[PDB]
Structure formats: structure tokens, C-alpha cells
């Protein structure tokens, strides 16, 4: 005939909205069991559930945000961001400013703020001393350093004065705010919070093969962006799998608004076997947690996010 489609388009957007809202409504107890099941059935799942219970919220704590906002040199930070903005003439009146911010936090943290700690420096000896350090292995925390979030201390013997120096591994980001050094663990922990203190939309992304980083939502790029603070890197997810040529299995991200499997973003070769969990389960698992997580939000927040969700899904599977 001559169908004409907006008449029909519009009808769709409308029935789609309701569809979506129904999904993110009722916590139907058919799932409550299937879920509950899986968290005992498979321990990998249990793993991530536990990770969500920590990561998905710890960082949304406004005391911390202000401690960090005190502690960083907000002057120097913005000063630079404004310099590097003035240089740009990208898109007319656009959110690109917050990208610069990230990039600058990225350099600030790495160049000025925080230190990488391979083996610690010998506190008795000078400052730049760390090979006349030989590892004696690990031990439980001295009780004093259990005040913070430390479950293990790597310990070192100095070969030049023969004194023990300790390197405790803390999860309290504020503590890190004082020690000012660590490995990717600490690096990512604190930098995630630094980012959240600007109320950027951030995720903490866990790679099963002992590496972690974060994701930030650039509004100007309209999608999640890969930020690693260690490598001082903005938007280059390939770094790990191609440049480092690292074998990877699962990559999953946790954020206050959801837990999503972000593997296909990162694991673009050197793909290990997935098999700690059945695929359909892992999907469900997230969706379920994400739901539980989004449980108390108005109807149009819910939709708006579930869209940004499907945006990502399409970016992941179509893997542009």
C-alpha cells in the first residue's frame, strides 16, 4: 500500500518504554531462587556478588569525597584543565571539558601525586633505595596497620643496613591518601575515588588475571571510556590485550548504577577460556544485581539508564 511509519514508530517507543519498566520493576521470586541458587552453586558468581557488595557503593561516601577534595591540589588541577581547554576548539559548546579534567587528574595523579612501589624504599637508609631490598615474603598485619584495610604485609630486608622495611597492602583509600604509593590495586582504588569526588560517573573494572582499572562516562564521547591511572592512559582498552599482549579471561565492571560484563571491550585477542560460570548465568547474575541496585529510582531515571545500557551492549557485541 503506502504504510507510513511514524504512526507505527511512535506506537513502538511507547510499548518499549513499558516493556523496559516492567523488567526493572517486580523482583519476582522465581529469580530470587534462581539467583540465590547460583550464589551457592557456583562460587565465581559468589565472587562477583561479593565484589558488587563492596565496590558498587563504598565510593559513594561524601565524607571521603571532601577529604580528598581538601587533599588534592584543586588549584593546580583546574589551572591546567583551563590551559588545555583554551587550546581546544573541538565542538562549539560541549561537555568535552570534563574529559580534559579526567586527563589532567590522570597526569596529576601519576606525575605528582602518587608513587609506584615495586619493592619499598628502605626507611632507615636514604630515600631512593630499593634493590638492596630482598623479599622475605608476607605476613599478617601488625594490628596497628589493621586499623586500615590491610590483610597482608609484604616484608623486605635491606641489604645495606640490614633493617626490615614493611609494605602493608591497604584497602582504605584514605590511608593511601597518606602513604601515597602502591601497585595497581592501590593505584586504582584511590583513583576511582578521586574520580568520584568530582562526581564523575565511574566504574571499577576487575580483570581476573590480576589487574584492575576504571571506566568513566564521557558525556562528550557519549559512552564509557577506559581510564587506567597506572599506565597514565585515557581511552585505549586495547593496551592490555594487544600492547602488553596479555592473556585475559573475564573482565567485569562494577559501578553504583550497575554491574556489567565488559570483556568484549578489552579481551580482543589472547582470549582465555570462560568457564567458571555458564554464560546465561553470568548474564542473569548481572542483570539481577543491576536490578536490585536500581530498585529505588524514579521511572524515567530507570528508563534513561536502561537505554545507556543497550547503547553499550550494541557497542560491545558490534564491537566497533
Amino acid at each position: 500500500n503506502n504504510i507510513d511509519f511514524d504512526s507505527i514508530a511512535k506506537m513502538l517507543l511507547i510499548k518499549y518504554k513499558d516493556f523496559i519498566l516492567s523488567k526493572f520493576k517486580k523482583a519476582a521470586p522465581v529469580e530470587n531462587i534462581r539467583f540465590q541458587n547460583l550464589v551457592h552453586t557456583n562460587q565465581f558468581a559468589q565472587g562477583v556478588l561479593g565484589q558488587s557488595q563492596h565496590l558498587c557503593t563504598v565510593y559513594d561516601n561524601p565524607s571521603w569525597h571532601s577529604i580528598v577534595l581538601e587533599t588534592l591540589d584543586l588549584d593546580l588541577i583546574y589551572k591546567n584543565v583551563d590551559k588545555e581547554f583554551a587550546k581546544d576548539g573541538h565542538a562549539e559548546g560541549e561537555n568535552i571539558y570534563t574529559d580534559y579534567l579526567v586527563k589532567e587528574l590522570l597526569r596529576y595523579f601519576k606525575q605528582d601525586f602518587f608513587k609506584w612501589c615495586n619493592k619499598p624504599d628502605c626507611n632507615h637508609c636514604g630515600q631512593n633505595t630499593s634493590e638492596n631490598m630482598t623479599p622475605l615474603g608476607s605476613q599478617g598485619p601488625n594490628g596497628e596497620e589493621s586499623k586500615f584495610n590491610c590483610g597482608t604485609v609484604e616484608i623486605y630486608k635491606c641489604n645495606r643496613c640490614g633493617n626490615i622495611t614493611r609494605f602493608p597492602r591497604y584497602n582504605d583509600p584514605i590511608k593511601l591518601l597518606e602513604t601515597r604509593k602502591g601497585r595497581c590495586g592501590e593505584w586504582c582504588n584511590l583513583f576511582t575515588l578521586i574520580l568520584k569526588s568530582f562526581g564523575l560517573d565511574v566504574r571499577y573494572v576487575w580483570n581476573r588475571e590480576d589487574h584492575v582499572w576504571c571506566e568513566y562516562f564521557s558525556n562528550f564521547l557519549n559512552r564509557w571510556v577506559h581510564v587506567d591511572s597506572c599506565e597514565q592512559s585515557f581511552d585505549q582498552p586495547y593496551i592490555y590485550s594487544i600492547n602488553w599482549n596479555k592473556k585475559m579471561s573475564y573482565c567485569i565492571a562494577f559501578g553504583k548504577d550497575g554491574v556489567v560484563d565488559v570483556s568484549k571491550r578489552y579481551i580482543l585477542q589472547n582470549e582465555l577460556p570462560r568457564d567458571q560460570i555458564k554464560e546465561e548465568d553470568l548474564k542473569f547474575l548481572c542483570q539481577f544485581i543491576t536490578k536490585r541496585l536500581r530498585y529505588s529510582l524514579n521511572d524515567d531515571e530507570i528508563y534513561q539508564l536502561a537505554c545507556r545500557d543497550e547503547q553499550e551492549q550494541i557497542e560491545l557485541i558490534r564491537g566497533k
Binding site: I3, F5, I8, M11, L12, K15, E310, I314
Partner: protein, 57 residues
């Protein structure tokens, strides 16, 4: 029965519905100018058709 949509369409379909609703008609258009069997369900009832669509998501 079931839709019968190309993996690429069904994808971009759910892309634009969620990301660019403005263009969803011209997509809906061309998609029909291409699947004879579907164009039918459209002609003889948009309703059935759209319900079918929501099955894919």
C-alpha cells in the same frame, strides 16, 4: 510465529530505538522495503508486528 530478522538489523533496530528514536521510522521503513514476509504483518496490522519486535531484546 517468529520475526526472522537479520542479526545486523535486529541489532541496529534495538540500537536506534534505545539511542536515536528520531530515526526509528526511516529504519522501520527500509527494513520493510526489504523483508516482503514482514511488510505483510505491517500492512495487515501494525499491532501484531510491533509485539513481535519486542520479542527481540
Amino acid at each position: 510465529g517468529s520475526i526472522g530478522l537479520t542479526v545486523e538489523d535486529l541489532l541496529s533496530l534495538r540500537q536506534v530505538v534505545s539511542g536515536n528514536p528520531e530515526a526509528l521510522a526511516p529504519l522501520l521503513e527500509n527494513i520493510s522495503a526489504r523483508y516482503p514476509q514482514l511488510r505483510e504483518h505491517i500492512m495487515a496490522n501494525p499491532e501484531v508486528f510491533v509485539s513481535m519486535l519486542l520479542e527481540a531484546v
